[PDB]
Amino acid sequence: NHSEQTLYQLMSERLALMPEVAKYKWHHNLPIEDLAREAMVLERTVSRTTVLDPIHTKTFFGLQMTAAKAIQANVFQSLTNTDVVASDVRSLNDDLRPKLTLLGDQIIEQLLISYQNGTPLNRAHFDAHFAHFELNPQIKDGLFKSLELVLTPDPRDTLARLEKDKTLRVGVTLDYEPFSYQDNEGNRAGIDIELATALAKEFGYRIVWVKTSWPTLMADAEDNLFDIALSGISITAQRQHRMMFSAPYHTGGKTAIGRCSSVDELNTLALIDRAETRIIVNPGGTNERFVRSALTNASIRIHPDNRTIFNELVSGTADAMFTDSIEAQLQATKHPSLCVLLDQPLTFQQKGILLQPDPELKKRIDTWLLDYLSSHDVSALFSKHGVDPD
Ligand SMILES: O=C(O)[C@@H]1C[C@]2(C(=O)O)C=C[C@@H](O)[C@@H](C2)O1
Numbered sequence: 001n002h003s004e005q006t007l008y009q010l011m012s013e014r015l016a017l018m019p020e021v022a023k024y025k026w027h028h029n030l031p032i033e034d035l036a037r038e039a040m041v042l043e044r045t046v047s048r049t050t051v052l053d054p055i056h057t058k059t060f061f062g063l064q065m066t067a068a069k070a071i072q073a074n075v076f077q078s079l080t081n082t083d084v085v086a087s088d089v090r091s092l093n094d095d096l097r098p099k100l101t102l103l104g105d106q107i108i109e110q111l112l113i114s115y116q117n118g119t120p121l122n123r124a125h126f127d128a129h130f131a132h133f134e135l136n137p138q139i140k141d142g143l144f145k146s147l148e149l150v151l152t153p154d155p156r157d158t159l160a161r162l163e164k165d166k167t168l169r170v171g172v173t174l175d176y177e178p179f180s181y182q183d184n185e186g187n188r189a190g191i192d193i194e195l196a197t198a199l200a201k202e203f204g205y206r207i208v209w210v211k212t213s214w215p216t217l218m219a220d221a222e223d224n225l226f227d228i229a230l231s232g233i234s235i236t237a238q239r240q241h242r243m244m245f246s247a248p249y250h251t252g253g254k255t256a257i258g259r260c261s262s263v264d265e266l267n268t269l270a271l272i273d274r275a276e277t278r279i280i281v282n283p284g285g286t287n288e289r290f291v292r293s294a295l296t297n298a299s300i301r302i303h304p305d306n307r308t309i310f311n312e313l314v315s316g317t318a319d320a321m322f323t324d325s326i327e328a329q330l331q332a333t334k335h336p337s338l339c340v341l342l343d344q345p346l347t348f349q350q351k352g353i354l355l356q357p358d359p360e361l362k363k364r365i366d367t368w369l370l371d372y373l374s375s376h377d378v379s380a381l382f383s384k385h386g387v388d389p390d
C-alpha cells in the first residue's frame with residue numbers, strides 16, 4: 001500500500017530534520033517551542049485540508065509537532081557537554097523550515113490521496129515504521145490514532161427535529177465518574193451532566209436522560225434512542241464510522257491501576273503482562289479493546305459493573321485494570337490502597353460528545369463547546385468532581 005508507506009516516510013523525514021533544528025536552537029540559546037511558528041503551520045495546513053475534519057487534522061499536525069519537540073529535547077540533553085559544532089549549524093529559516101513546509105505540503109497531498117482511496121491503515125506497519133524513534137508510547141499512539149480519525153468519513157435530520165420539539169435526548173451511562181454517575185442521594189451527577197445541561201440551556205433545549213451503556217452504546221445510537229451522549233466517551237475511529245463527535249473536551253490515555261502493596265511487581269507493561277497477573281476490565285468500550293490488543297500473557301476477567309470493579313483490585317481478586325488515566329487518578333485518590341501503576345499513559349485518547357450524524361448539529365455543538373472551554377473554568381468543573389487539575 002504505497003499511499004500509507006509514503007505518508008509514514010514523509011512524517012519520519014519531518015522528524016529527521018529535528019536534530020538539526022535543535023542544534024540551531026541550542027547554538028542560539030533558543031527555546032524548543034515556537035508557538036507563532038506552530039500557529040503559522042497549523043493555519044496553513046487547515047486551509048489546505050478543508051475536505052478533512054479540521055479538529056482531527058490539527059490534532060494530527062499538533063502531535064507531529066509534539067513528536068518534533070520531544071526529539072528536539074532528546075537532542076538538547078545530548079548537547080549538555082558535547083555542544084554544537086558551531087560550524088555545522090544549519091539555518092532554521094533558510095534551510096530547515098522551508099524543508100518542513102515542503103514536507104507539510106507533501107503530507108497533505110498524501111492525506112488527500114489516502115482519504116479519497118479509503119486507504120486501510122495498518123497499525124502493525126505504522127509501529128514497524130516508527131519503532132526506532134525515541135518517543136514515548138503516548139505520542140506514537142496519538143500519531144497513529146489522530147491520523148486514523150483524519151482518514152475516516154449517511155446522515156440524520158436530528159437538528160431539524162430538535163428545532164421543532166426542543167427535546168434533547170441525552171444518552172448517559174452513570175457508571176463512569178467523574179463524567180456520569182449517581183451520588184449516594186441517587187441523582188445524576190458529573191462533568192457530563194453539567195456539560196449537557198449548559199448545552200441545553202444555551203440551545204434552548206430541555207433534556208430527556210436516556211440510559212445507555214458501553215455494550216449497547218452504538219446499537220442505542222443507530223436506533224436513534226438519543227440525539228447526543230455524554231459519559232466520558234472516547235473518540236475512536238470505529239465509533240466515528242457510524243456516529244459523529246464534538247470537539248474533544250479532555251486529553252489523556254490508558255494507564256494501569258492496582259494495589260500500592262503490589263506496585264514494584266507491576267510498575268511496567270512487561271511486569272503487568274505476565275501469565276500470573278489477573279486483569280479485570282469492564283465490557284464493551286475502549287478499555288476492552290485496549291487490553292485485547294495490548295496483552296498477550298495476562299488472563300482477563302470481564303466485570304460487568306464499572307461502579308464496583310475497583311473493589312476487586314482493593315480486595316485482591318484482580319491485580320491490575322487498564323483504564324483512562326483520569327479514572328485511574330480519581331480511583332487512586334478515592335481508594336488509598338490503590339495507586340496508578342505506570343509512569344505515564346500508554347495511549348492517546350480524547351473524550352468528545354457522541355452525536356447522531358448531522359453535520360449542522362456538529363457545527364453548532366462544536367461552536368458552543370469551544371466557546372465554553374474558553375470562557376468557563378473547565379478546571380473547576382473537573383475539580384468539583386474529584387479530578388486533581390494536573
Ligand atoms: O522550530 C521549529 O520549527 C520546530 C518544528 C515545529 C514543528 O513541528 O513544526 C514548529 C515549531 C516549534 O515549536 C517546534 C516544532 O520546533
Ligand SMILES: [Cl-]
Nearest residue numbers: 252253325326
Ligand atoms: Cl484519560
Ligand SMILES: [Cl-]
Nearest residue numbers: 233234285286
Ligand atoms: Cl470508552
